[PDB]
Amino acid sequence: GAMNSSNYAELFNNDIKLFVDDTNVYRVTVHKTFEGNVATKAINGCIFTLNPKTGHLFLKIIHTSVWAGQKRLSQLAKWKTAEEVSALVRSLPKEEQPKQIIVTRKAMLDPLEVHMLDFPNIAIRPTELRLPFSAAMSIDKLSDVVMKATEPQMVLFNIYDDWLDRISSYTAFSRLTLLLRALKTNEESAKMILLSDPTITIKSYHLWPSFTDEQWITIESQMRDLILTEYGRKYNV
């Protein structure tokens, strides 16, 4: 069934699983027309498919050409996500295919179940966690490859950089979700925290800065303060 705080450690066991997030698949800017009506212009999107144990991210870039001439785009986007996840699973060797796929939004359950009918043994699950994966486009290098794409494209990342050399996948996921929650609540503050010190750089083959263990403790503390703050600024507390 559903994934929640009670079965949280299942994410880091040795059964291959993938989180799928569709928030950023169908992305638009809203604008006025010359006649003063409103219109949308789509921009490139992405499916966020992540193995929480390994950090492997399968970033499927959704080019705006896939919406041309289509109707009911918000509904299509869910089926397009399910099509691409299904195509990803089929592309993986049997021993790499997931045993579970956890969707971050319940509206993905039926589209993905129908597309995975050929895989009756892969469990499709919702979650009660409020995960901050929509903030993936706040990661500069991920945003950059999405916006630059001129055609459909799959790009592979490790969202944990080299963290697993020093920490467990539970701790790596906790760090990731804290960073993303901060980036979602106040992108600018979050990004200032991460880059304020120009002596700490992002390796060409990484997404986040090369912090020592001690600097990550400081950074992690600053992100919590930010999240608590914004929670005050928002609610006045």
């Binding site: 299509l76 089926w79 099509e83 039926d110 589209p111 129908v114």
Partner: protein, 300 residues
């Protein structure tokens, strides 16, 4: 007009014949049921006074043989039986009727209700859903499960309804996943109508039979089958016009006949709201929507 006599009535029982019913007391001198209209299937059904649990009964067609009910004190139920011999069947009935302790099937001449509920129901198809080939009549009761229910445990006592499952490879063409799930016309017209049922009359017959088993026996898997067959039509964008017209008539008489007090368990809110207000056919069931709204507006 045909007759289903009774050897005796040894236990207190409410007896149903089609949509009619009457109470018989323990060892009352009850002889059976006469004047049963020929040309329709019928169902004779039973609820014991001492155990309202297990409604049970028999689907039959008097053109297919001579039938009578007698109580079995070992199995503790009223059993339907056949007399292959005719003269002796008429002979046994002959003494019993001058002494007229036999209820008359009480049909009003204006009344097409039973016909409207059984228009497409055939005994030959009933006997394929209820498998017991040594008898010409079919036993059903409250607790029998369907083939599909057993997939999710005795197969000889199952209701072999046609399996409908909207999230199945049968229902969904590879490459038309979104199209076929949101518009089931492929599944209805090609898979089920052309493929399995062959024509809409057979489809409607199973639908009507599932409803009647839900209503008369409170058979839950039958209710699931009735709603599934309605939803597959309502969720198809492309349905022959004659099937929609006839569906509206079928459902109207089903809703009309349903006991007012059983609506809470026999009607699925989701399906009916979807079918009448969201589905492709939301505007095609005028009679059914009108009676539903005037009789069960709470459900909606």
């Amino acid at each position: 007009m045909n007759t289903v006599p009774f050897t005796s009535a040894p236990i207190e029982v409410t007896i149903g014949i089609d949509q009619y019913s009457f109470n018989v007391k323990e060892n009352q001198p009850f002889h059976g049921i006469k004047d049963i209209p020929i040309g329709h299937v019928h169902v004779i059904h039973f609820q014991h006074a001492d155990n309202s649990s297990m409604r049970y009964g028999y689907w039959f067609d008097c053109r297919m043989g001579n039938f009578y009910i007698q109580y079995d004190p070992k199995d503790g139920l009223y059993k339907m039986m056949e007399e292959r011999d005719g003269a002796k069947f008429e002979n046994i009935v002959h003494n019993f009727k001058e002494r007229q302790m036999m209820v008359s099937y009480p049909k009003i001449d204006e009344d097409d209700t039973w016909y409207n509920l059984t228009e497409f129901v055939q005994m030959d198809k009933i006997r394929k859903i209820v498998r017991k080939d040594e008898n010409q009549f079919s036993y059903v009761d409250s607790s029998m499960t369907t083939v599909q229910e057993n997939e999710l445990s005795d197969p000889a006592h199952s209701l072999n309804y046609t399996v409908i499952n909207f999230k199945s490879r049968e229902a969904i063409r590879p490459g038309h996943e979104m199209e076929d799930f949101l518009d089931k016309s492929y599944y209805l017209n090609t898979v089920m109508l052309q493929g399995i049922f062959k024509n809409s009359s057979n489809y409607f017959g199973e639908l009507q039979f599932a409803f009647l088993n839900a209503m008369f026996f409170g058979n839950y898997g039958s209710s699931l089958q009735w709603h599934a067959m309605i939803e597959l039509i309502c969720s198809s964008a492309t349905v022959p016009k004659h099937m929609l017209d006839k569906l509206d008539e079928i459902l109207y008489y089903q809703i009309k006949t349903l006991p007012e007090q059983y609506s809470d368990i026999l009607l699925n809110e989701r399906v009916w709201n979807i079918c009448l207000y969201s589905s492709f056919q939301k505007n095609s069931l005028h009679n059914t929507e009108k009676i539903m709204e005037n009789k069960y507006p709470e459900l909606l």
